[PDB]
Design a protein around this ligand. Sequence first.
Ligand SMILES: *Cc1cc(C*)cc(C*)c1
Lengths: 411, 14
Amino acid sequence: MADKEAAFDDAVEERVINEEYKIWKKNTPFLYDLVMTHALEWPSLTAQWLPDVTRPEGKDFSIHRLVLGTHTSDEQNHLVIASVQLPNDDAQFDASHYDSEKGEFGGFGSVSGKIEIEIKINHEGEVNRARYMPQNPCIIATKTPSSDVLVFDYTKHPSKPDPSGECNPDLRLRGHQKEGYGLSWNPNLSGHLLSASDDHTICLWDISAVPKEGKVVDAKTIFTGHTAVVEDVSWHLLHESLFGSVADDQKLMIWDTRSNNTSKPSHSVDAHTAEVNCLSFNPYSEFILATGSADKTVALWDLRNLKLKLHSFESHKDEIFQVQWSPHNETILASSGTDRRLNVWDLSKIGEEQSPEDAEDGPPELLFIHGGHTAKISDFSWNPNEPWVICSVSEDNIMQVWQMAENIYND
Amino acid sequence: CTKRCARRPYKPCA
Ligand SMILES: *Cc1cc(C*)cc(C*)c1
């Protein structure tokens, strides 16, 4: 009865998905400068580009790397480092993009970039979120279905995993009681890691002095200001004491580590009209952050006056789970979620006068809609070394490395 | 054409 109408709603929407994908596949030469669709072995709940890029001399490509996880209900889940062949910006545009190999004069053109798996490390349950520490990018922290946050060093592990299945983390970080998804490393303090969880708490560890030899580290500070499930937490990128957290009590809370009150934050906004799932600070604007939520909106915030919302970005059709600023342009925001769309926003076009044809397509700050995933996008990541290149993963084992066309943004 | 297609990726225009 309850699963009868749920399977009725999933079967009507699957024909809407299959009709939307083939229209998107026809529109792919006019929308993108790169499409790399790779079917993964297992679905990934996390995606983040490693910041190192190796560029071989004489070749038109470079090797970029990704931090991936697996989302299996069987007991062989893996922390996965993959490697992507991305073309350089001094390389010639041809038919090597769009996963194509048909030449433009009746034959073969060029090959596309390939995605292989380098390192697999055994993991206690599925990887909810995996993030590298920026001061040492060999250190990757993960989130488990249990209460433990695990810290991995992939140079101290073999590339092929054990068939025994024993997960051996380099550190075991405890302090939570339930699972969670939020994770943030401090870029101005080494080893300061934040984590959000379902036990209404934010934990903070300092692992900068303990050796990475399998010991158990307890939490330095536990922040108990939220009253519901804490979805995401993020450090500020310039000031080392400030961090932000969003939760299921519709609240954005800005904290300070110099405060002694660990149950009351520095500021607190009634941020949305539903559960707030993600936040991201601007890397170029020190007062600006963005929060995304289950009321199909992205909210723009100013830290100097948090009681007034700056802007509401409205084009999504379902619950928004990840928001990320672009690390090359300060006005470029991206967001994804349950509506199988990754929207790219441009806040410099806020307030521009449109035609009524263009008003039906959306607001003028909406720049691009990625319509390539056929399931719910769990996580995405901007490439920090190649501009406008986004990896994005979804629940149907689909990872898409893509870049939009140049005349959309450059005018 | 390219900027209007960016905001309507499910438009078939055919
Ligand atoms: C010019 C153009 C562009 C797109 C994306 C689609 C069509 C049909 C025409």
